[PDB]
Design a protein around this ligand. Structure first.
Ligand code: FAD
Ligand code: MTE
Ligand code: MTE
Ligand code: MOS
Ligand code: MOS
Ligand code: FES
Ligand code: FES
Lengths: 1221, 99, 50, 50
């Protein structure tokens, strides 16, 4: 029997399948849906849930957070499970955590707030009066694609200076019979021993069954790899597995002790006994404070990490050098083996038997004159698996320099943790000086002989990191040795912010099941240019669930596959897990084709002109030739592609509930697929979980096949994707290849410019050229160029087709121009600040596309940021710091921004709406713009409340449809707030126009009276609103027109600090100012600014897309995708908003943000650039540098050339086809 | 419209009215069912007037649309309703009428 | 502005489906609000005539 | 194929309501009991104004 508690109610399961997880069980069965499916692999942190367990011995209960997407059902017998819905609710008393996380404007999309509020609740339960350090430690695992985390720390900053455990659980724990439980299934058997002996027996039984303790390392293998275990074993609370002991041999820790308990025990023990005895504890704490997150640290334990044999292990090399021995136990007695290379190499002689659970591990006291240190480097500061980590310790004894003990181990380099032996065998004898470092380097360089086939790439990077860590070890030991010798304009809380922080918000999958539902799943091609000759589907048809395996034979791959992730078949099944299992075993016959295209440089024109470049080039002082590559991006919208399609059974009516941005395409494609007039097919949205684009084309074709299935078989069909095939199906930004030839006078001013932009489109032959047009225009933000000759091309590749993004093309071309400017400023000899000032637009100027611009706003914000951030004192302190430090280079940068707002044609701007007033004072408004996180509906409520004088209570919006407001537009371009707001304006003006007499006869009443009277005298109370949109014209044959309604003007200064040894960087302070006007809602504006800045910084520094040479993209592993986390924020971000300007055709003198602040994230980018230059300033080498984008720590470390890079084995280029192109 | 179908045959009347006034065939029009989210504050379907009342309301909405489609059909002799509708989409002509 | 009524069709109601359908629906909605799940109500012929 | 109000599919976890009428035209209510009624298998609640 399964008995536990969810939110305080007892839940019983019988006759289960243990192969099913917890999160799908909480959604599809117990239906407390305030917990979100983020990734299913432990990365996201969206599924945070509190688990409380009582210990019958200690008479106390321990609370810990955990990711419910990896937790299995059969590990919860007797534990309290608490979701977001158990702390407070909109009916009962709201808990102060949700109240303060919504009051402080900590919510934008709301698809991340329940996990984060549960994390803060869990820490407040464990800790009454915490510190900000503890709070930030707690929230480290959780991610947010929208907010930028600042208001969340803001709400946490006030804490620093009741739910009850069920008695039934504590009494059945006080009884706690010796019950060994079996959970059976047709496929997979589960055994759970409450006693040690039964665990030893079942291990002495069939030994291919893993001892599951945290599921953190077996879950990914059973999922993505797909391996299946017929039988598994999982212990209960066994004391021997979880005990801390102090002895003369240091201390002894149980394998059942979780990493969080380990960290707390080490942290308390290092404050008791002198530091002369403790060196390895500090190394373990150092690598424990940086391990993935509090959730995983409370899910994972010592023994599982030790025996997992993951090469990237953050704690193994510290143990593999510290003289550690694993204790074992089984039916054939006891054992005590040491942990060294022989344990990790997988050789049989030193290892565990098919029996002998690992019982414990002992860490000795560090001897005097012995020091331990460990270092690691990963793509991100926190929650990132390292690419090289090391464990290092050296024991001297007797106060000399002679090496008698020296243990160094390297993890993440080879297939396992490699420890230096022969170099360790030869280093013995010499003094703690430079010569042993030369000897160690000259040995370990070719002792760890890597090849061009090293998985994960970054060969020379790891090769440099090795000696870099050794050098750090040298300096730290030498240092210690030397030592010992009208609601508009007021900040208003979001409409559904509480409804987010309390988990009432419905999404496209949170809605219930409808009778006789189905489920659909795809199978995707993994070959680039491969002909299909046959498909094997005999064995796929016959299994429980399969209705029909839909193919291209009846929008899918017919004969050949031209891109990986192309759809070839879809599967129809009665349920989700059955659909996935059926899909995973369809076999396709392929024959690979010779011409393979994956890169731009080996694969019509769009050209703008201004002046004559030729005459200036004949005249100008210095000619520059430069080039850049900028790689793409992935959206990583938190909510995945969820949709449902419902046939009606009468008149071929088809409802389509889909969480898209553009219902018009969905309706159109479903109508064309079903061969129906569009009046039969209706589409429904209520809100979308943080979509930043990309939910347009692939959503369209997914909805097409889903609707085809829902029609032909005459039943409802649900379809939700997962994160991996979300990346594999949907593309991202176009990566750009930019060449440029510029001309600049000695006055440091650019008077000559030629551009040849190249885009990496994708497999689609007819595609969206538009960005090549659009990004052609927005190339220069603030700099006046007397001459331009700018062309662009689009290059097809055997790759998934790329789409739009937030910012949309401005960041790419803007940084191409910014990099050309910066390299000119370097080639000249004057500071980039001066070059940008004496190249910046005047007060009034004219764009190359012939359009008047007035820009005193830009100069004023230039002065305000320059003077009120103390630019001169901070900069001179920066050069002083670089003049008294050698490996720590800090860099300071400033960047302007002009962003154009406008669209393409006439049809693009039109926006409709529908407004009702019922016979009370209460209004129902609907429109065609999609809610996806910007807070458009709060602005709509404010608009309606100012235009009808009623308080904000009286208005309610009930989602969107295509049956109320037809023929809406794309919900993008950062204008749909303005466009649909103007439509709402028109509707409300019509209604207030209809009612002059009633209102003007009735001075001191309510809207109840006036709506009653309006009905009495037969006056319509529901009207259609409509706005024609702004006029936009662009001609390419002449390259002239008025395509942009207006422009937003901003500036950002950024300070960073990079390290030349380990190639990472810090973010210290960013000061950012923009001109927006009389804002509708200041809080929403500041939130959008912060989010855009964080997204741009993430694109420019962190995020990279590594492709296999055959075109296969990598989703998890060493090269997995990262997004900025809670520790990537600047320490101080002082942001101020400037006074308005009262613009002409902007709604209520407010400007439309949401794509503007993205490019300002290049600020920190150029900041690190500055720092790198200072390094090459002091290294005495001024050789050519080519810094592309993104600036990963690999290329930052490559830029800081040293003697270490001069002693790296250069592999031959045409030797092996490496991990990535 | 705001009137209930109860077997008397009002929705067939409404489709006939729309077919005659907008000069499109019977087959090209659809109707779903009464609701208070699209047509608020409707009155009770009692008195034998609701059929004619909502017929006049449907006539009114149809007329408001057809006056906006006046120039488009003025500039095109033989247009299927798709052609005029897409054109009216291009010149930013509204297509949602309250009668 | 929270309550939306939907009537696709009615099977032959020859007058008089107004006050009594209202008194049914009031308590049906009371029940549906108090116990947070849908409530379906159908009347028998004798219950009608009574 | 004409879908009526009862022809909608079953929605998840919907209850069912049935009414208990009166039988005497003019009378006075002295006491009401539900103990056998509420202890039936299937009952969620009984709504009365008492
Ligand atoms: C998203 C993510 C992020 C991560 N980040 C980090 C990080 O920053 N740093 C880091 O160091 N690690 C990291 N890891 C790795 C993680 O810490 C380990 O996988 C984890 O500690 C394993 O513990 P477990 O009990 O969950 O393993 P389990 O899945 O329970 O163990 C599976 C395997 O371990 C064996 N096993 C487990 N316990 C025993 C035992 N007592 N005796 C014998 N065999 C046993 C089983 O037989 C089986 O083969 C990360 C993992 C994930 C998924
Ligand atoms: N919180 C949040 N902010 C967001 C997004 C989002 O998904 N979530 N999308 C961005 C994108 S892609 C656009 S184009 C704008 C559109 O919103 P607006 O028209 O209201 O500016 O919102 C931006 N800001
Ligand atoms: N088939 C049918 N005819 C019917 C009814 C009905 O329910 N079904 N109701 C009657 C009543 S009471 C009225 S008032 C009228 C209403 O129709 P109209 O108001 O649309 O003219 O239909 C009458 N004829
Ligand atoms: O929301 Mo737009 O940037 S595809
Ligand atoms: O006038 Mo009749 O529909 S009660
Ligand atoms: S952390 Fe649970 S789904 Fe990603
Ligand atoms: S608001 Fe946090 S994920 Fe969107």
């Amino acid at each position: 029997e399964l008995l536990f508690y969810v939110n305080g109610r007892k839940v019983i399961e019988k006759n289960v399948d243990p192969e099913t997880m917890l999160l799908p069980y909480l959604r599809k069965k117990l239906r407390l849906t305030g917990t979100k499916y983020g990734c299913g692999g432990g990365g996201c942190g969206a599924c945070t849930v509190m688990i409380s367990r009582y210990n019958p011995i200690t008479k106390r209960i321990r609370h810990h957070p955990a990711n419910a997407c990896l937790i299995p059902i059969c590990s919860l017998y007797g534990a309290a499970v608490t979701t977001v819905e158990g702390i407070g609710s909109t009916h009962t008393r709201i808990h102060p955590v949700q109240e303060r996380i919504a009051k402080c404007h900590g919510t934008q999309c709301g698809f991340c707030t329940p996990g984060m509020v549960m994390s803060i609740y869990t820490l407040l339960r464990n800790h009454p009066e915490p510190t900000l350090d503890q709070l930030t430690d707690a929230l480290g695992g959780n991610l947010c694609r929208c907010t930028g985390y600042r208001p969340i720390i803001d709400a946490c900053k006030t804490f620093c200076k009741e739910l009850i455990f069920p008695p039934e659980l504590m009494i059945m724990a006080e009884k706690q019979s010796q019950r060994t439980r079996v959970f059976g299934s047709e496929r997979m058997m589960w055994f759970s021993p409450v006693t040690l002996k039964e665990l030893l027996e079942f291990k002495f039984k069939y030994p291919q069954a893993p001892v599951i303790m945290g599921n953190t390392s077996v879950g990914p293998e059973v999922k993505f790899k797909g391996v299946f275990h017929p039988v598994i074993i999982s212990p209960d609370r066994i004391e021997e597995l979880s005990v801390v002991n102090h002895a003369y041999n240091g201390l002894t820790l149980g394998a059942g002790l979780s990493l969080a308990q380990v960290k707390d025990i080490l942290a308390d023990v290092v404050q008791k006994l002198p530091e002369e005895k403790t060196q390895m504890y500090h190394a373990l704490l150092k690598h424990l404070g940086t391990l993935a997150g509090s959730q995983i640290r409370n899910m994972a334990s010592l023994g599982g990490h030790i025996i997992s044999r993951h090469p990237d292990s953050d704690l193994n090399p510290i143990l593999a050098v510290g003289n550690c021995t694993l204790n074992l136990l089984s039916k054939e007695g006891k054992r005590q083996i040491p942990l060294n290379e022989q344990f990790l190499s997988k050789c049989p002689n030193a290892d565990l038997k098919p029996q002998e659970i690992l019982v414990s591990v002992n860490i000795p006291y560090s001897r005097k004159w012995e020091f331990v240190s460990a270092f690691r480097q990963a793509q991100r500061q926190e929650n990132a698996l390292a690419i090289v980590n090391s464990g290092m310790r050296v024991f001297f004894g007797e106060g000399d320099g002679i090496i008698r003990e020296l243990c160094i181990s390297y993890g993440g380099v080879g297939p396992a943790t490699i420890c230096a032996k022969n170099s360790c065998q030869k280093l013995i004898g010499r003094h703690w000086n430079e010569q042993m470092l030369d000897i160690a380097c000259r040995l370990i360089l070719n002792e760890v002989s890597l090849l061009g086939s090293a998985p994960g790439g970054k060969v020379e990077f790891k090769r440099t990191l090795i000696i870099s860590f050794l050098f750090k070890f040298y300096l730290e030991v030498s240092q210690i040795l030397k030592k010992m010798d009208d609601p508009i304009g007021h900040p208003i809380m979001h409409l559904s912010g509480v409804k987010h922080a309390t988990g009432e918000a419905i999404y496209c999958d949170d809605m219930p099941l409808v009778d006789q539902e189905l489920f659909l799943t795809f199978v995707t091609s993994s070959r680039a240019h491969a002909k299909i000759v046959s498909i094997d589907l005999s064995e796929a048809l016959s299994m429980p669930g399969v209705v029909d395996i839909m193919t291209a034979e009846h929008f899918l791959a017919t004969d050949k596959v031209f891109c990986v992730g192309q759809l070839v078949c879809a599967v129809l099944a009665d349920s989700e897990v059955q659909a996935k299992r059926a899909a995973k075993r369809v076999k396709i016959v392929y024959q690979d084709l010779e011409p393979l295209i994956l890169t731009i440089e080996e694969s019509p024109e769009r050209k703008l002109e201004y002046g004559n470049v030729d005459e200036a080039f004949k005249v100008v002082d210095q000619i520059l030739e430069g080039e850049i590559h900028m790689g793409g991006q992935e959206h990583f919208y938190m909510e995945t592609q969820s949709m449902l399609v419902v046939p009606k059974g009468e008149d071929q009516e088809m409802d389509v509930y889909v969480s898209t941005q553009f219902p018009k395409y969905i309706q159109d494609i479903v109508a064309s697929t079903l061969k129906l007039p569009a009046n039969k097919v209706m589409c429904h949205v209520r809100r979308v979980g943080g979509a930043f684009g990309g939910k347009v084309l692939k959503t369209g074709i997914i909805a097409a096949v889903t609707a085809f299935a829902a029609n032909k078989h005459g039943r409802a069909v649900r379809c939700v994707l997962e994160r991996g095939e979300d990346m594999l199906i949907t593309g991202g930004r176009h990566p750009y290849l930019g060449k440029y030839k510029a001309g600049f006078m000695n006055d440091g001013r650019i008077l000559a410019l030629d551009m040849e932009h190249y885009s990496n489109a994708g497999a689609s032959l007819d595609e969206s050229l538009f960005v090549i047009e659009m990004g052609l225009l927005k190339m220069d933000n603030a700099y006046k160029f007397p001459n331009l000759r700018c062309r662009g091309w689009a290059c097809r590749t055997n790759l998934p087709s790329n789409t739009a993004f937030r910012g949309f093309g401005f960041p790419q071309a803007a940084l191409i121009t910014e990099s050309c400017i910066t390299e000119v400023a370097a080639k000249c000899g004057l500071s980039p600040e001066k070059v940008r000032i004496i190249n910046m637009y005047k007060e009034i100027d004219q764009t190359p596309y012939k359009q008047e611009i007035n820009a005193k706003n830009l100069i004023q914000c230039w002065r305000e940021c320059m003077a009120m951030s103390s630019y001169s004192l901070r900069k001179v302190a920066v050069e002083k710091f670089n003049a008294e430090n050698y490996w720590k280079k800090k860099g300071l940068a400033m960047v302007p921004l002009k962003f154009p707002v406008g669209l393409g044609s006439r049809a693009a701007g039109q926006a409709a709406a529908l407004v009702h007033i019922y016979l009370d004072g209460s209004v129902l408004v609907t429109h065609g713009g999609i809610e996806m996180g910007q807070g458009v509906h709060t602005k709509m409520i404010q608009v309606v409340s100012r235009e009808l004088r009623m308080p904000m209570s009286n208005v309610h919006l009930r989602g969107t449809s295509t049956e109320t407001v037809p023929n809406a537009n794309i919900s993008g371009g950062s204008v749909v707030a303005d466009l649909n707001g103007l439509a709402v304006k028109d509707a409300c003006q019509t209604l207030l126009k209809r009612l002059e007499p009633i209102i003007s006869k009735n001075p001191k009443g309510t809207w109840k009276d006036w709506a009653q009277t309006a009905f009495d005298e037969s006056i319509n109370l529901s009207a259609v609103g409509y706005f024609r949109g702004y006029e936009s014209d662009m001609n390419w044959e002449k390259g002239e027109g008025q395509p942009f309604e207006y422009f937003v003007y901003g500036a950002a200064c950024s300070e960073v600090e990079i390290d030349c040894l380990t190639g990472d960087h810090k973010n210290i302070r960013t000061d950012i100012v923009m001109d927006v006007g009389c804002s509708i809602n200041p809080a929403i504006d500041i939130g959008q600014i912060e989010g855009a800045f964080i997204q741009g910084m993430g694109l420019y520094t962190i995020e990279e897309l590594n492709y296999s040479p055959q075109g296969i993209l990598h989703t998890r592993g060493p090269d997995q995708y990262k997004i900025p986390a809670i520790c990537d924020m600047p320490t101080e971000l002082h942001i101020a908003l400037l006074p308005p300007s009262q613009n002409s055709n902007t709604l209520y003198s407010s400007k439309g943000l949401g794509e503007s602040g993205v490019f300002l994230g290049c600020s920190v980018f150029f900041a690190i650039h500055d720092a790198v230059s200072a390094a090459r300033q002091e290294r005495g080498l001024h050789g050519p540098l080519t810094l592309n984008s993104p600036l990963t720590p690999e290329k930052i470390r490559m830029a800081c050339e040293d003697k270490f890079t001069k002693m790296i084995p250069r592999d031959e280029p045409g030797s092996y086809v490496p991990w990535n192109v």
